[PDB]
Amino acid sequence: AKKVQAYVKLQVAAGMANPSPPVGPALGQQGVNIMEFCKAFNAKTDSIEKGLPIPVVITVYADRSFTFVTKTPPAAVLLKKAAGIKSGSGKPNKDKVGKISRAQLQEIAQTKAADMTGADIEAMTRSIEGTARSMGLVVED
């Protein structure tokens, strides 16, 4: 990749690649093939895990078929199934409501090693500070 051309990312799902009300048609309809994300995706699905958030880019020009790419999960979301609470407030952030796991934030961030600029993997942590002071939820460090 030394040249971007077309990319729309709308976090899909693994266990069955065959939506319809969420995405379905709207994921493939301008030279894209609905028949091949269940031939090709699931070929890169089961090696890892299934069910949870999947942003994604594909290689469709106007060339009929294509080839599918993978990505990475959102980072403040690894503070849901990778922290506690699943909203983020409840008392609008006029109140500092949330609550953290200091141990986590490094290895749970580190899981997103393949998409960050910090050389120091510790730096990749310091990013997650603000990503996790996104409400004003203090970490019991």
Partner: protein, 148 residues
């Protein structure tokens, strides 16, 4: 910008890299994207991390203010846009190599690579380098010399 108290640090820091360095390259980043820096930082990355720089400064007034120190072969580089690269550890290395390979992927010009300092001179891409540790090319020069 900042006053002098800050134009001095960009000096005392950047010139103690020359005073305590290894190799020097060259490059003019007219069109220097950011996928540009992103990459070359992973390269500095492989090439240790943050052992490398490129601090755009070609204000003669800056990264020549570090030259009448060492490398006064650069009164001549410093004109126009430039991206100075210093080495601390590492072989007089590969730093050299990918700048040509990078910019030869379009990746903008390379100042024709006006070149620099290890010797005290000018241009020409060399891999006379990171063979370094290719002292094995003097290990194979053993048994093959002993046998043949």
């Amino acid at each position: 910008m900042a006053l002098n108290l800050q134009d001095k640090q960009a000096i005392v820091a950047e010139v103690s890299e020359v005073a305590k360095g290894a190799l020097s390259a060259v490059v003019a980043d007219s069109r220097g994207v950011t996928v540009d820096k992103m990459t070359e930082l992973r390269k500095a990355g492989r090439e240790a991390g943050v052992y490398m720089r490129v601090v755009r400064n070609t204000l003669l007034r800056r990264a020549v203010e570090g030259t009448p120190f060492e490398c006064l072969k650069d009164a001549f580089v410093g004109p126009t846009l430039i991206a100075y690269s210093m080495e601390h550890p590492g072989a007089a290395a590969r730093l050299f190599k990918e700048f040509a390979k990078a910019n030869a992927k379009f990746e903008v010009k390379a100042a024709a690579f006006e070149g620099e300092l290890i010797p005290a001179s000018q241009i020409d891409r060399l891999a006379t380098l990171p063979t370094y540790e290719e002292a094995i090319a003097r290990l194979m020069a053993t048994m093959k010399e002993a046998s043949a």
